[PDB]
Design an enzyme around this catalytic site. Structure first.
Site, PDB file in Angstrom:
ATOM      1  N   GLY A  69       3.096  -2.445  -0.469  1.00  0.00           N
ATOM      2  CA  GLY A  69       3.775  -2.809   0.762  1.00  0.00           C
ATOM      3  C   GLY A  69       3.013  -2.426   2.028  1.00  0.00           C
ATOM      4  O   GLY A  69       3.562  -2.498   3.131  1.00  0.00           O
TER       5      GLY A  69
ATOM      6  N   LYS B  78      -1.792   4.572  12.754  1.00  0.00           N
ATOM      7  CA  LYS B  78      -3.215   4.822  12.592  1.00  0.00           C
ATOM      8  C   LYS B  78      -3.470   5.055  11.110  1.00  0.00           C
ATOM      9  O   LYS B  78      -2.675   5.687  10.430  1.00  0.00           O
ATOM     10  CB  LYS B  78      -3.664   6.002  13.463  1.00  0.00           C
ATOM     11  CG  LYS B  78      -5.068   6.468  13.184  1.00  0.00           C
ATOM     12  CD  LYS B  78      -5.850   6.769  14.453  1.00  0.00           C
ATOM     13  CE  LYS B  78      -6.693   5.575  14.883  1.00  0.00           C
ATOM     14  NZ  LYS B  78      -7.638   5.085  13.822  1.00  0.00           N
ATOM     15  N   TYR B  79      -4.551   4.482  10.597  1.00  0.00           N
ATOM     16  CA  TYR B  79      -4.923   4.721   9.214  1.00  0.00           C
ATOM     17  C   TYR B  79      -5.855   5.926   9.220  1.00  0.00           C
ATOM     18  O   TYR B  79      -6.923   5.900   9.806  1.00  0.00           O
ATOM     19  CB  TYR B  79      -5.657   3.499   8.651  1.00  0.00           C
ATOM     20  CG  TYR B  79      -6.032   3.667   7.204  1.00  0.00           C
ATOM     21  CD1 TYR B  79      -5.065   3.835   6.237  1.00  0.00           C
ATOM     22  CD2 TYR B  79      -7.361   3.667   6.811  1.00  0.00           C
ATOM     23  CE1 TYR B  79      -5.415   3.998   4.893  1.00  0.00           C
ATOM     24  CE2 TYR B  79      -7.720   3.830   5.479  1.00  0.00           C
ATOM     25  CZ  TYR B  79      -6.751   3.993   4.531  1.00  0.00           C
ATOM     26  OH  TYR B  79      -7.121   4.151   3.214  1.00  0.00           O
TER      27      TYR B  79
ATOM     28  N   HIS C 144      -3.170  15.932   1.597  1.00  0.00           N
ATOM     29  CA  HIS C 144      -1.716  15.897   1.453  1.00  0.00           C
ATOM     30  C   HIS C 144      -1.170  17.324   1.502  1.00  0.00           C
ATOM     31  O   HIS C 144      -1.348  18.116   0.572  1.00  0.00           O
ATOM     32  CB  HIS C 144      -1.316  15.208   0.149  1.00  0.00           C
ATOM     33  CG  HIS C 144       0.159  15.181  -0.100  1.00  0.00           C
ATOM     34  ND1 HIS C 144       0.852  14.014  -0.320  1.00  0.00           N
ATOM     35  CD2 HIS C 144       1.078  16.179  -0.179  1.00  0.00           C
ATOM     36  CE1 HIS C 144       2.133  14.291  -0.526  1.00  0.00           C
ATOM     37  NE2 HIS C 144       2.295  15.598  -0.448  1.00  0.00           N
TER      38      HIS C 144
ATOM     39  N   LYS D 244       0.101  12.537  -8.623  1.00  0.00           N
ATOM     40  CA  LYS D 244      -0.398  13.897  -8.560  1.00  0.00           C
ATOM     41  C   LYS D 244      -0.889  14.457  -9.920  1.00  0.00           C
ATOM     42  O   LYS D 244      -0.375  14.140 -11.004  1.00  0.00           O
ATOM     43  CB  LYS D 244       0.658  14.777  -7.891  1.00  0.00           C
ATOM     44  CG  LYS D 244       0.543  14.815  -6.363  1.00  0.00           C
ATOM     45  CD  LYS D 244       1.741  14.273  -5.677  1.00  0.00           C
ATOM     46  CE  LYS D 244       2.785  15.337  -5.474  1.00  0.00           C
ATOM     47  NZ  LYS D 244       3.720  15.009  -4.350  1.00  0.00           N
TER      48      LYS D 244
ATOM     49  N   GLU E  79       6.486  11.202   5.113  1.00  0.00           N
ATOM     50  CA  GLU E  79       7.727  10.944   4.388  1.00  0.00           C
ATOM     51  C   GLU E  79       8.473  12.232   4.181  1.00  0.00           C
ATOM     52  O   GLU E  79       7.836  13.282   4.037  1.00  0.00           O
ATOM     53  CB  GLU E  79       7.438  10.333   3.005  1.00  0.00           C
ATOM     54  CG  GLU E  79       8.710   9.885   2.267  1.00  0.00           C
ATOM     55  CD  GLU E  79       8.445   9.191   0.944  1.00  0.00           C
ATOM     56  OE1 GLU E  79       7.327   9.353   0.384  1.00  0.00           O
ATOM     57  OE2 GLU E  79       9.374   8.501   0.461  1.00  0.00           O
TER      58      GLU E  79
ATOM     59  N   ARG F  43      14.978  15.755  -2.068  1.00  0.00           N
ATOM     60  CA  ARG F  43      15.248  16.145  -3.450  1.00  0.00           C
ATOM     61  C   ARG F  43      14.350  17.316  -3.805  1.00  0.00           C
ATOM     62  O   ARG F  43      13.420  17.621  -3.072  1.00  0.00           O
ATOM     63  CB  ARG F  43      14.898  14.999  -4.398  1.00  0.00           C
ATOM     64  CG  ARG F  43      13.458  14.469  -4.244  1.00  0.00           C
ATOM     65  CD  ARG F  43      13.173  13.489  -5.345  1.00  0.00           C
ATOM     66  NE  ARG F  43      11.980  12.723  -5.053  1.00  0.00           N
ATOM     67  CZ  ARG F  43      10.777  13.214  -5.221  1.00  0.00           C
ATOM     68  NH1 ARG F  43      10.633  14.408  -5.723  1.00  0.00           N
ATOM     69  NH2 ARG F  43       9.688  12.482  -4.944  1.00  0.00           N
TER      70      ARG F  43
HETATM   71  N1  LIG Z   1      -1.095   6.368   8.071  1.00  0.00           N
HETATM   72  C1  LIG Z   1      -1.757   6.523   6.807  1.00  0.00           C
HETATM   73  N2  LIG Z   1      -3.068   6.734   6.758  1.00  0.00           N
HETATM   74  C2  LIG Z   1      -3.709   6.876   5.567  1.00  0.00           C
HETATM   75  N3  LIG Z   1      -3.036   6.841   4.383  1.00  0.00           N
HETATM   76  C3  LIG Z   1      -1.691   6.656   4.374  1.00  0.00           C
HETATM   77  C4  LIG Z   1      -1.014   6.496   5.615  1.00  0.00           C
HETATM   78  N4  LIG Z   1       0.288   6.321   5.339  1.00  0.00           N
HETATM   79  C5  LIG Z   1       0.449   6.372   4.026  1.00  0.00           C
HETATM   80  N5  LIG Z   1      -0.727   6.589   3.403  1.00  0.00           N
HETATM   81  C6  LIG Z   1      -0.904   6.683   1.987  1.00  0.00           C
HETATM   82  O1  LIG Z   1      -0.258   5.511   1.341  1.00  0.00           O
HETATM   83  C7  LIG Z   1      -0.053   5.978  -0.026  1.00  0.00           C
HETATM   84  C8  LIG Z   1       1.085   5.271  -0.665  1.00  0.00           C
HETATM   85  O2  LIG Z   1       2.328   5.732  -0.229  1.00  0.00           O
HETATM   86  P1  LIG Z   1       3.561   5.360  -1.138  1.00  0.00           P
HETATM   87  O3  LIG Z   1       3.762   3.853  -1.121  1.00  0.00           O
HETATM   88  O4  LIG Z   1       3.219   5.827  -2.538  1.00  0.00           O
HETATM   89  O5  LIG Z   1       4.867   6.037  -0.599  1.00  0.00           O
HETATM   90  P2  LIG Z   1       5.887   6.814  -1.496  1.00  0.00           P
HETATM   91  O6  LIG Z   1       5.709   8.293  -1.277  1.00  0.00           O
HETATM   92  O7  LIG Z   1       7.339   6.415  -1.110  1.00  0.00           O
HETATM   93  C9  LIG Z   1       5.632   6.459  -3.293  1.00  0.00           C
HETATM   94  P3  LIG Z   1       4.814   7.911  -4.033  1.00  0.00           P
HETATM   95  O8  LIG Z   1       4.982   9.142  -3.075  1.00  0.00           O
HETATM   96  O9  LIG Z   1       5.487   8.257  -5.408  1.00  0.00           O
HETATM   97  O10 LIG Z   1       3.351   7.600  -4.246  1.00  0.00           O
HETATM   98  C10 LIG Z   1       0.127   7.408   0.066  1.00  0.00           C
HETATM   99  O11 LIG Z   1      -0.764   8.043  -0.877  1.00  0.00           O
HETATM  100  C11 LIG Z   1      -0.261   7.819   1.374  1.00  0.00           C
HETATM  101  O12 LIG Z   1      -1.169   8.933   1.207  1.00  0.00           O
HETATM  102 CL   LIG Z   2       8.796  14.771  -7.439  1.00  0.00          CL
HETATM  103 MG   LIG Z   3       6.300  10.779  -1.472  1.00  0.00          MG
END
Ligand SMILES: Nc1ncnc2c1ncn2[C@@H]1O[C@H](COP(=O)(O)OP(=O)(O)CP(=O)(O)O)[C@@H](O)[C@H]1O
Ligand SMILES: [Cl-]
Ligand SMILES: [Mg+2]
Ligand SMILES: Nc1ncnc2c1ncn2[C@@H]1O[C@H](COP(=O)(O)OP(=O)(O)CP(=O)(O)O)[C@@H](O)[C@H]1O
Ligand SMILES: [Cl-]
Ligand SMILES: [Mg+2]
EC number: 6.3.4.14
Lengths: 442, 442
Positions: free
Chosen positions: A165, A199-200, A206, A235, A285, A289
């Site tokens: 997404g 921003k990426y 983490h 992880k 995020e 939980r």
């Molecule tokens: N602004 C950003 N810059 C660089 N990386 C980013 C970012 N925002 C998110 N990411 C990365 O996008 C990746 C995917 O996030 P994800 O879709 O998995 O969210 P999520 O936490 O709800 C599912 P999960 O935590 O189980 O992987 C993450 O590993 C995160 O590190």
């Molecule tokens: Cl977890």
């Molecule tokens: Mg998460």
């Protein structure tokens, strides 16, 4: 208060919850699938109920069956663990409306932090630092969006508010098409087209902060964990505290997280996840939980996080004050999975022989036992090996030694991967980024 | 310094020592009998040497073979563990004279504390409280002895200085005959007729203080343990700290123990054992070695006692100062033995299935593994289950729960005895005396 708890989960976390319940004198109801009749915690529980056939959709995700189990046993509360229904607000709502305590936050709070745009808004309101971004949904006006993207600075990432997404954009050349695509992808698979930009960050770690908040107006922070050692967003190794983080920085970010809990009405355990890059924190995020890697926090703070969950859900205050918490030492956790150590394909089957490690500073959290069959139907986690040391170096050496003692015979495991990681000279130095494991693996 | 250590022991303590060595990067030499080729630590050691056939006399007590093992491997030091040769001064002397470091005190100190009369003399000189007594060997002059006994107050106990050999006397009617008998018994079986008298304490607890002393002039005390839960002078359950002991009392007795170490030239780990009755301490013995129950001290202080032994033997200072030590929480240890839980007859044989407990606050120190055969030739200890809690009540509940998870299939164990003890309402209150278990058992 809490006299009887439904453990609405399986595997190691179900056993972790059972152990906490039994220490507190809380009766347990193990709800399980047909495939999990021989789970260690099911065998130890006070009462058991089969809630469906093997597939998760038909069992561990079966909201009416789980609520019905609580009804028939006269339970007081349901612990959702992690995964499964733990961040399903519909479930939380139905549990509460049906007269049970949901061991977690309120549904409204789950939904709030389950939406990226609303989560970020609340974090900004609370003074928690966020990734520079569009701060709200993006228009279609390419001129406006090209302007925001320019302000932010390429590369940027477009993200669906309801995602789980994403799309990285490295030049304005691509932006209009990218924002449109991500909008359309999110609307069909998630019935929500809302997207924003931020921003990426290309070189981050983490780093995540553990909190507790009770119904007495208290909220505490319990240092942080570094969970950068991941493959394919999954992880592998976690540690606490995070290398490079000082007590002063910890107090700053931690207190902001604790205030956020109070502002949003948070209740229970939760985690604020950040990307940490060039010495700054940026919120991505909140996991509303308990988490898999909770033990490394327990090891360096002396807190029993699942016991506090249960206390809080019973209406009690958190059992200590912020000033009582002091980071001591260092801890590591290796997620031991039944999988091929190079292809990562699952490895279900009978564990003919299990030899688990022990001694000073070694903790083993696992439902696996000799003669247990690892089923195909769920995740491949079979054990969490956790070490503690007065220093990071000691934790690491202890982990290496514990792994060398560990024998799991009959199935493949990822122990060889952990051994490779622990001896890596960059990991030993500490502070590698979230891309390191994939880079190392080639 | 220490680059290579001979582990002159077996079973769990050998594995404990191996783990500490491997954490410090010290190479290991496992010396073992023909019957112990499949011991866990032998399998993990860097080098192995078979030092004799099964009987202890021919192997673990074989001084020339053990020294020869150190010679051929170019080892630097020998760790004697507990039992076996650990308090054999002849062994310590031969190890040092042969050019190796004995991980323990000097022979002269072993001999000094190995003789009851000289031990008591040194303790009195150092300000350590002792049982009121004859303070030196008793004459034959019944008039003099009847006078000392009267001064002390019946009942008294007559004790051979070289014993390990006692006789309780409850009236003057018996005294002359008793002193003569104990003299004669000690002279034939121990070639030493020296005996003294001291007050027989009828209602005491076993409370013992852990110390460390280094070659830098430092000596520390590490709280105490209560080891009153015993049968036939053999320990079953130990805990730390001892119920009823305040920090002020701990500082008082502990500091006296630390000064004693300095006065006598002590080096390494040791324990001062006391009988504790009506709120007073009375010295009975110093164990000049690491002990089985060391883990409960590690749990409440954060000290790694075997690592400190190795440091000290290498010539390093103890790694912390007295002010750094603070008792936190409470710990329990259950000695799990391969024996019938009611007759206490040993139960050798193949462990078909082992399931060891885990989770937060659970430590398991054991060399036993599924498929391991418990031999007949040595003691019946197979595992030490150690729990920690913020309170004694939590430690106890955790121990109960861990025991309920523990499965040892193929042999009998004393787990049923531990379960009976832990649920005993007097044990739960705390502070029972050294006679309680025998009284309870009938
Ligand atoms: N602004 C950003 N810059 C660089 N990386 C980013 C970012 N925002 C998110 N990411 C990365 O996008 C990746 C995917 O996030 P994800 O879709 O998995 O969210 P999520 O936490 O709800 C599912 P999960 O935590 O189980 O992987 C993450 O590993 C995160 O590190
Ligand atoms: Cl977890
Ligand atoms: Mg998460
Ligand atoms: N003055 C006294 N009053 C009452 N009991 C005493 C006593 N002196 C010694 N005892 C008890 O005599 C018992 C036997 O002591 P023991 O002979 O076992 O010495 P020891 O420590 O060298 C062998 P172990 O420690 O392995 O049992 C001890 O349990 C001790 O509690
Ligand atoms: Cl001992
Ligand atoms: Mg003794």
């Amino acid at each position: 208060m809490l006299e009887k708890v439904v453990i609405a989960n399986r595997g190691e976390i179900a056993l972790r919850i059972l152990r906490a319940c039994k220490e507190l004198g809380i009766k347990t109801v193990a709800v399980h699938s047909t495939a999990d009749r021989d789970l260690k915690h099911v065998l130890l529980a006070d009462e058991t109920i089969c809630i469906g056939p093997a597939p998760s959709a038909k069992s561990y995700l079966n909201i009416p069956a789980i609520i019905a189990a609580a009804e028939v046993t006269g339970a007081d509360a349901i612990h959702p663990g992690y995964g499964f229904l733990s961040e399903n607000a519909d479930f939380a709502e139905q549990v509460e409306r049906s007269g049970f305590t949901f061991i977690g936050p309120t549904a409204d709070v789950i939904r709030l932090m389950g939406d990226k745009v609303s989560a970020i808004k609340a974090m900004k309101k609370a003074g928690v630092p966020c990734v520079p971004g569009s701060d709200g949904p993006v228009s279609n006006d390419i001129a406006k969006n090209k302007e925001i993207a320019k302000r932010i600075g390429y590369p940027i990432i477009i993200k669906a508010s309801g995602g789980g997404g994403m799309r990285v954009v490295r030049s304005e050349d691509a932006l209009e098409e990218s924002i449109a695509m991500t909008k359309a992808e999110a609307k069909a698979a998630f019935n929500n087209d809302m997207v924003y930009m931020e921003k990426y960050l290309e070189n981050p770690r983490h780093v995540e902060i553990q909190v507790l908040a009770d119904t007495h107006g208290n909220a505490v922070y319990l240092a942080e964990r570094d969970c950068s050692m991941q493959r394919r967003h999954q992880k592998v190794v976690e540690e606490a505290p995070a290398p490079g983080i000082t007590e002063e920085v910890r107090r700053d970010i931690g207190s902001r997280c604790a205030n956020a809990c109070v502002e949003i009405g948070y209740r229970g355990a939760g985690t604020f996840e950040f990307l940490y890059e060039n010495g700054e924190f940026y919120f991505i995020e909140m996991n509303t939980r308990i988490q898999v890697e909770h033990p490394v926090t327990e090891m360096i703070t002396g807190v029993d996080l699942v016991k506090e969950q249960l206390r809080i859900a019973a209406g009690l205050p958190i059992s200590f004050k912020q000033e009582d918490i002091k980071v001591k030492g260092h801890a590591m956790e290796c997620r031991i999975n039944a999988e091929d150590p190079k292809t990562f394909l699952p490895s279900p089957g009978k564990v003919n022989h299990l030899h688990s490690p022990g001694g000073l500073g070694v903790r083993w959290d696992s439902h696996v036992y000799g003669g247990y069959t690892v089923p195909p139907h769920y995740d491949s986690m079979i054990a969490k090996l956790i070490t503690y040391g007065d220093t990071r170096e000691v934790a690491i050496r202890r982990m290496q030694n514990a792994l060398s003692e560990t024998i799991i015979d009959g199935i493949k495991t990822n122990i060889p991967l952990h051994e490779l990681i622990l001896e890596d000279e960059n990991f030993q130095k500490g502070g590698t980024n979230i891309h390191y494991l994939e880079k190392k693996l080639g």
